[PDB]
């Protein structure tokens, strides 16, 4: 679909606020994305994968550093995503540290 309504879908996913209920936030999203729209990073998933491993080692979720080794091959195996480096660089930036806690559910 068109990217303008997609940037609107982001701001109504995060907030409970419409494009009319706030107009500054949705204006600010168009301000930030549309000046540097195309990525400045190229395909370097390998380096960021070895930091996701290293991040799950620091939390002692050491089975999930080896579960991610299956998942990172699965992500390339499907191949329906245009940039595989971007989404991992996004999820790694939003990471948090409990203190050393290991919590598991799924799979």
């Amino acid at each position: 679909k068109s990217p303008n309504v997609l940037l609107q879908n982001l701001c109504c996913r995060i907030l409970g606020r419409s494009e009319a209920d706030v107009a500054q936030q949705f204006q600010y999203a168009v301000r930030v994305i549309g000046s540097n729209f195309a990525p400045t990073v190229e395909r370097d998933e390998f380096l960021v994968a070895e930091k996701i491993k290293k991040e799950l080692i620091r939390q002692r979720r050491e089975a999930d550093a080896a579960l991610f080794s299956e998942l990172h091959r699965k992500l390339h195996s499907q191949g329906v995503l245009k940039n595989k480096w971007s989404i991992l660089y996004l999820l790694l930036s939003l990471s948090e540290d409990p203190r050393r806690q290991p919590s598991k559910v799924s799979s």
């Binding site: 000046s35 540097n36 400045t40």
Partner: protein, 57 residues
């Protein structure tokens, strides 16, 4: 005077301080050799007159 002395001294002082901070930054990446910056700032004066302004994308 105040325009044949003072304005030129002010201009010199600005350029010398700005370039000095740029040198001390452009040398700190290189790796000892940072002991010149250590010895030069023995009081702790002029140890933060510039840091690079950060931005993403």
């Amino acid at each position: 005077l105040v325009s044949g002395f003072e304005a030129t001294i002010n201009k010199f002082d600005k350029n010398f301080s700005a370039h000095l901070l740029d040198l001390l930054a452009r040398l700190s990446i290189y790796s000892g050799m940072a002991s010149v910056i250590s010895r030069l700032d023995f009081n702790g004066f002029y140890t933060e007159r510039l840091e690079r302004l950060s931005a993403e994308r």
